Design an enzyme around this catalytic site. Sequence first.
Site, mmCIF file in Angstrom:
data_model
loop_
_atom_site.group_PDB
_atom_site.id
_atom_site.type_symbol
_atom_site.label_atom_id
_atom_site.label_comp_id
_atom_site.label_asym_id
_atom_site.label_seq_id
_atom_site.Cartn_x
_atom_site.Cartn_y
_atom_site.Cartn_z
ATOM 1 N N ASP A 115 0.975 -1.127 0.073
ATOM 2 C CA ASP A 115 0.177 -0.108 -0.020
ATOM 3 C C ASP A 115 0.902 1.211 -0.063
ATOM 4 O O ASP A 115 0.616 2.121 0.809
ATOM 5 C CB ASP A 115 -1.116 0.102 1.236
ATOM 6 C CG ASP A 115 -1.987 1.059 1.084
ATOM 7 O OD1 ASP A 115 -2.238 1.600 0.005
ATOM 8 O OD2 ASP A 115 -2.591 1.296 2.115
ATOM 9 N N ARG A 133 -0.547 9.011 1.181
ATOM 10 C CA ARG A 133 -1.361 9.003 2.707
ATOM 11 C C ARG A 133 -0.603 8.056 3.707
ATOM 12 O O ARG A 133 -0.891 8.507 5.047
ATOM 13 C CB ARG A 133 -2.791 8.523 2.461
ATOM 14 C CG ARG A 133 -2.696 6.933 2.312
ATOM 15 C CD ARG A 133 -4.317 6.271 1.767
ATOM 16 N NE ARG A 133 -4.305 5.051 1.455
ATOM 17 C CZ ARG A 133 -4.179 4.869 0.116
ATOM 18 N NH1 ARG A 133 -4.100 5.990 -0.682
ATOM 19 N NH2 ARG A 133 -4.265 3.604 -0.354
ATOM 20 N N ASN A 134 0.118 7.499 2.972
ATOM 21 C CA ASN A 134 1.055 6.436 4.020
ATOM 22 C C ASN A 134 2.456 6.989 4.215
ATOM 23 O O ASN A 134 3.138 6.196 4.920
ATOM 24 C CB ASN A 134 1.078 4.970 3.782
ATOM 25 C CG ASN A 134 -0.550 4.432 3.678
ATOM 26 O OD1 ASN A 134 -1.251 4.661 4.629
ATOM 27 N ND2 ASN A 134 -0.935 3.607 2.681
ATOM 28 N N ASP A 147 3.173 4.075 7.507
ATOM 29 C CA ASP A 147 2.096 2.996 7.779
ATOM 30 C C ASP A 147 2.271 1.663 7.189
ATOM 31 O O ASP A 147 2.775 1.790 6.036
ATOM 32 C CB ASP A 147 0.549 3.680 7.454
ATOM 33 C CG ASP A 147 -0.307 2.747 7.733
ATOM 34 O OD1 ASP A 147 -0.599 1.744 7.032
ATOM 35 O OD2 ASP A 147 -1.276 2.875 8.638
HETATM 36 C C1 LIG Z 1 0.252 6.875 13.050
HETATM 37 C C2 LIG Z 1 0.434 8.205 12.593
HETATM 38 O O1 LIG Z 1 1.712 8.965 13.133
HETATM 39 C C3 LIG Z 1 2.170 10.018 12.872
HETATM 40 C C4 LIG Z 1 1.574 11.046 12.420
HETATM 41 C C5 LIG Z 1 2.064 12.498 12.482
HETATM 42 C C6 LIG Z 1 1.370 13.804 12.052
HETATM 43 C C7 LIG Z 1 0.189 13.777 11.521
HETATM 44 N N1 LIG Z 1 -0.498 15.005 11.341
HETATM 45 N N2 LIG Z 1 0.506 15.610 12.070
HETATM 46 C C8 LIG Z 1 0.529 17.292 11.800
HETATM 47 C C9 LIG Z 1 0.631 17.750 13.397
HETATM 48 C C10 LIG Z 1 0.745 19.212 13.346
HETATM 49 N N3 LIG Z 1 1.402 19.886 12.313
HETATM 50 C C11 LIG Z 1 1.198 19.457 11.047
HETATM 51 C C12 LIG Z 1 1.550 17.965 10.768
HETATM 52 C C13 LIG Z 1 1.707 14.906 12.345
HETATM 53 C C14 LIG Z 1 3.307 12.485 12.548
HETATM 54 N N4 LIG Z 1 4.307 11.485 13.081
HETATM 55 C C15 LIG Z 1 3.844 10.301 13.129
HETATM 56 N N5 LIG Z 1 4.458 9.139 13.488
HETATM 57 C C16 LIG Z 1 0.253 8.479 11.029
HETATM 58 C C17 LIG Z 1 -0.658 9.047 10.093
HETATM 59 CL CL1 LIG Z 1 -1.806 10.038 11.392
HETATM 60 C C18 LIG Z 1 -0.981 9.171 8.877
HETATM 61 C C19 LIG Z 1 -0.084 8.630 8.074
HETATM 62 C C20 LIG Z 1 1.161 7.602 8.406
HETATM 63 F F1 LIG Z 1 1.899 7.034 7.793
HETATM 64 C C21 LIG Z 1 1.337 7.730 10.157
HETATM 65 CL CL2 LIG Z 1 2.435 6.650 10.657
#
Ligand SMILES: C[C@@H](Oc1cc(-c2cnn(C3CCNCC3)c2)cnc1N)c1c(Cl)ccc(F)c1Cl
Length: 292
Positions: A146, A150-151, A167
């Site tokens: 995938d 988005r991932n 992801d």
């Molecule tokens: C599980 C989640 O983890 C994270 C999300 C985020 C994230 C999502 N959105 N934001 C915003 C926070 C405020 N500033 C802009 C980015 C940070 C950062 N690091 C991560 N490890 C995640 C999300 Cl939510 C989406 C795609 C991914 F591949 C992953 Cl792995």
Amino acid sequence: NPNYCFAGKTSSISDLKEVPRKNITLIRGLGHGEVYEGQVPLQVAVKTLPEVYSEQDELDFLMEALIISKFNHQNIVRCIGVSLQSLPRFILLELMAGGDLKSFLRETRPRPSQPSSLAMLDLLHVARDIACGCQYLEENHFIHRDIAARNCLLTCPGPGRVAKIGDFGMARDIYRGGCAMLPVKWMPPEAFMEGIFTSKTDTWSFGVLLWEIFSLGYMPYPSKSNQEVLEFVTSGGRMDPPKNCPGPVYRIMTQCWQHQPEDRPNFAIILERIEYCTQDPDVINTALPIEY
Ligand SMILES: C[C@@H](Oc1cc(-c2cnn(C3CCNCC3)c2)cnc1N)c1c(Cl)ccc(F)c1Cl
């Protein structure tokens, strides 16, 4: 607890690094399972398992932790550890302040106010980063299944950003869903027709990711539904170049979308072609479109 094998080593949940719950503080939601910014101080992203979820969701959640914890590459998000001894269960990940790649592309599109927000080289660097992650997966015989904007995640908004694969939910499911949830727009014919997956599956998906990147965050196959895409691609149909896309970049896409998997490039070759693109002034001096 279930076991997981990667490279030459087998692992179980007992191998996950348990972080004491008292050392973990939630700070804010990061657009939601739910995800938070947390501290351990070490800045982390906290992935939570809703308590109302089932035993199977529990197992999938833990399996994803195992999977990410066993990778070691700069373009794959790090797992800091887990907090599994208290509810709700936490997985602690590298905090990627730039957020997911699709949202980033859409929100950072060059505008009349910010015409220089992004350039072609920025996009090629994101593509290279994810290709490097995919090459690592390929050489370690792991099929992601995938690969899509988005991932993917970015370490930060600004110029020093690094893109990483974040992801692994799809690979987790297959390792142990409905038809309408399958990422058919990212899948090659042998995958959605025969359920056959190889590293050349990920090559096809990477081609679609490239289109996502150079379109600046458009949904693939504009105006087409999943079933329409299935019939389109099976019949030989392919997406047109994104607006202003350099020919050499579009050429990488169309090579990724060769009908026969044996005719598609591996990621070493993809990386070489991306590198050549970054060297070509006619490519990197190409202006991105400015939406009004
Ligand atoms: C599980 C989640 O983890 C994270 C999300 C985020 C994230 C999502 N959105 N934001 C915003 C926070 C405020 N500033 C802009 C980015 C940070 C950062 N690091 C991560 N490890 C995640 C999300 Cl939510 C989406 C795609 C991914 F591949 C992953 Cl792995």
